[PDB]
Amino acid sequence: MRPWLEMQINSNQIPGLIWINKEEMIFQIPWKHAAKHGWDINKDACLFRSWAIHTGRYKAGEKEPDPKTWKANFRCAMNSLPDIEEVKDQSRNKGSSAVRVYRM
């Protein structure tokens, strides 16, 4: 009965993905819009990916790389969660990202 979002990110920020616990409450998430030219699936759409294969939406070695979704699924999720509010001061545009507080 594996973790649920507040966990997966909790841990996932505690290892080495690519964003931070820029605080001991708050964290970041690489929201590079994916039309920006410097967009590498393997560098931006990661957590997004981790989580989809984690939660079992996708499975590496699959034919749908579709990380747009991976992002939505992940966006929406982060939405729902009640113990992680995105500190809205940051609807970022370039060298962009989304920011949230974990409800303590």
CB of 46 to DNA, least distance (A): 12
CA distance 74 to 78: 6
Judged by CB under 7 A, the chain residues 45 through 104 that form the site for DNA are 51, 55-57, 67-69, 71-77, 79-81, 91-94, 96, 98
Running DSSP on this structure, what letter comes out for residue 69?
Answer: H
CA distance 61 to 75: 23
Q: What angle do CA 56, 67, 50 make, to 5 degrees?
A: 45
Among 12, 27, 31, 49, binds DNA (CB under 7 A): 31
Provide the binding-site residues for DNA, judged by CB under 7 A.
1, 4-6, 31-39, 51, 55-57, 67-69, 71-77, 79-81, 91-94, 96, 98
